[PDB]
Design a protein around this motif. Structure first.
Motif, short mmCIF file in Angstrom:
data_model
loop_
_atom_site.label_atom_id
_atom_site.label_comp_id
_atom_site.label_asym_id
_atom_site.label_seq_id
_atom_site.Cartn_x
_atom_site.Cartn_y
_atom_site.Cartn_z
N UNK B 75 0.81 -1.21 0.00
CA UNK B 75 0.00 0.00 0.00
C UNK B 75 0.84 1.26 0.00
N UNK B 76 1.93 1.22 0.75
CA UNK B 76 2.74 2.42 0.95
C UNK B 76 3.44 2.83 -0.32
N UNK B 77 4.02 1.83 -0.99
CA UNK B 77 5.05 2.10 -1.97
C UNK B 77 4.90 1.27 -3.26
N UNK B 79 5.11 -0.87 -6.30
CA UNK B 79 6.28 -1.62 -6.77
C UNK B 79 7.62 -0.85 -6.74
N UNK B 80 7.65 0.31 -6.10
CA UNK B 80 8.92 1.01 -5.85
C UNK B 80 9.90 0.08 -5.16
N UNK B 81 11.16 0.09 -5.58
CA UNK B 81 12.11 -0.88 -5.03
C UNK B 81 12.51 -0.58 -3.60
N UNK B 82 12.31 0.65 -3.14
CA UNK B 82 12.56 0.97 -1.74
C UNK B 82 11.42 1.79 -1.15
N UNK B 167 9.59 -5.09 -21.88
CA UNK B 167 10.63 -4.09 -21.64
C UNK B 167 10.57 -3.53 -20.21
N UNK B 168 9.39 -3.56 -19.59
CA UNK B 168 9.26 -3.02 -18.24
C UNK B 168 9.48 -4.07 -17.16
#
Ligand code: CA
Ligand code: CA
Ligand code: CA
Ligand code: CA
Ligand code: CA
Ligand code: CA
Ligand code: CA
Ligand code: CA
Ligand code: CA
Ligand code: CA
Ligand code: CA
Ligand code: CA
Ligand code: CA
Ligand code: CA
Ligand code: CA
Ligand code: CL
Ligand code: NA
Lengths: 313, 323
Positions: B75-77, B79-82, B167-168
């Motif tokens: 929920x927070x982030x 698929x952001x890696x951090x 590609x993504x």
């Protein structure tokens, strides 16, 4: 039983044989014996000349009408004489000539073929028919030179033949949405007779192109006091496919933080990013908003961009 | 204050797994801030309360910071890696503000999921091996090795599986037709696509794939017998049954539906002397037989289906005229 053979389609008057020579009748007696051809309810194919004894062609002998695709074609008749009464039977073999072209049942063949079909796919074509027999019937087909299809001619168990296209190189709707070919049917006559059948291939678009954004990065500057509805950016992707396959939907990407959807709004159709909540310069000076473009086709591949929203004091 | 920062960041920096229970101890901000536990109570140490959820609270007596609400990295982030949650701490007497931050680390708490509970494909048995069919994609909202890694396909005799990476970095599977389908033998095929993440153990989702094989006209009619014999009295009236011929076809529907007709392989007059029911294959007398005119009739009959590119079958009826 006397036996004669002639080519079909001989002119009226064409000599078939002679009753003096072949039936042993006396020439001087033919009128007196009232020599006549007995035709029954069938056509008067043959008549006899009293002066010469010759039997001859008296009506059109069309082997195709008489015998269809039978390998052999025989017309029978009788001759009657009187004083005394005698009946003689004869048979005339009617030999085929190459008086017919092959023909296709339609004037053209239209095909719809997805550019997504793999090479190796085969497509049977409309058959030609030639009403002659033996060598004068259908022999093979030829295909016009082209960049996609090879031809195979198949012979069925009953000896009839049809052509098959074999896709050798993939079709490409983006490059060539329409392919024209010509199928020629040939009989085995000398010289050969032929017919042609245009084949109009309409290539069907498949979703083989992803959307692509005009740029990867968009930058915006927005006053922190900007009211809801304030336009921030408009992103734009294009897709080479047609229809649903090329129709683009914009959405917030998964690469976003909680809050993006309450602070910003995105029109899924127009790609317009607007302010939805309240910006605050002291809380966050820069927002990073990932936006995805997808088509409405099968197996859509996403395109992605990023909008950097700089908040201004 | 002597060391509140390291290389531009607050030294009040902690890293914890997501989804810890409430009360989970994150760190002691007093020990790390070097505040005087002596007079701490006078300073009313607390987390600054903004519009966002109070994910962390601090014990104003001890300085212990702890988890105060659910921290779901997904929920927070997304698929952001951090994933870093930032907050502020305040004390009074004197008034001061400190930055703090907590890295929220991914755990493999999600299965991949498919957007539908099933998938159907209709595939002609006439399609060539090598043809590919894209399947629904799964998504796994965890990150790194905890996200979607691969797909597997149930054991079957027609299709291999390929996994493609876009590609993504997202992945989908496609069936590859390895052996031709055959409607006559198996008119439907059932498969299961499994999506797996790279956790230990791998978590998974399944997608039933039901394939309907589409029939093609790949069978010719076949007569029960090639030769039929009949003896008919020469005074047989119209309507007299001569023979019934029978062909069968293994294909479906129109592709297998048989039409009987007089073959091109016939002499003129066959249609005037005989009649043939195009559905039943019953051959009847139509005209008038005559034993002195013709003792034996050879009739060729053709069977063709109603499908594409029909192949005809042929038989012969020998009709002996009886004086
Ligand atoms: Ca002719
Ligand atoms: Ca001919
Ligand atoms: Ca011909
Ligand atoms: Ca293409
Ligand atoms: Ca396309
Ligand atoms: Ca597309
Ligand atoms: Ca402000
Ligand atoms: Ca403010
Ligand atoms: Ca301001
Ligand atoms: Ca979670
Ligand atoms: Ca997972
Ligand atoms: Ca997780
Ligand atoms: Ca089959
Ligand atoms: Ca079939
Ligand atoms: Ca069939
Ligand atoms: Cl003449
Ligand atoms: Na420092």
């Amino acid at each position: 039983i006397i036996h004669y053979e002639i080519l079909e389609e001989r002119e009226r008057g064409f000599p078939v044989g002679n009753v003096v020579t072949d039936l042993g009748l006396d020439l001087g007696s033919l009128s007196a014996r009232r020599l006549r051809v007995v035709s029954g309810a069938s056509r008067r194919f043959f008549e006899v000349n009293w002066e010469t004894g010759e039997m001859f062609v008296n009506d059109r002998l069309d082997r195709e009408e008489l015998c269809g695709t039978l390998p052999s074609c025989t017309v029978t008749l009788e001759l009657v004489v009187e004083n005394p009464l005698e009946l003689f039977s004869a048979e005339v073999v009617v030999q085929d000539i190459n008086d017919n072209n092959p023909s296709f049942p339609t004037g053209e063949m239209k095909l719809e073929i997805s550019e997504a079909l793999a090479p190796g796919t085969r497509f049977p074509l409309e058959s030609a028919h030639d009403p002659d027999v033996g060598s004068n019937s259908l022999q093979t087909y030829e295909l016009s030179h082209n960049e996609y299809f090879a031809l195979r001619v198949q012979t069925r168990e009953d000896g009839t033949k049809y052509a098959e296209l074999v896709l050798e190189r993939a079709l490409d709707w983006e490059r060539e949405p329409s392919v024209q070919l010509v199928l020629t049917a040939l009989d085995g006559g000398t010289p050969a007779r032929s017919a042609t059948l245009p084949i109009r291939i309409t290539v069907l678009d498949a979703n083989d192109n992803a959307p692509a954004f005009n740029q990867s990065l968009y930058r915006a500057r927005v006053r922190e006091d900007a009211p809801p509805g304030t336009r921030v950016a408009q992103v734009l992707a294009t897709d080479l496919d047609e229809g649903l396959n090329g129709e683009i939907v914009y959405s917030f990407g998964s690469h976003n933080r909680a809050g993006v959807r309450e602070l910003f709004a995105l029109d899924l159709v127009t790609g317009v990013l607007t302010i939805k909540g309240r910006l605050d310069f002291e809380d966050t000076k820069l927002h990073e908003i990932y936006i995805q473009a997808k088509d409405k086709g099968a197996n859509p591949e996403g395109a992605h961009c990023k909008v950097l929203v700089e908040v201004v004091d």
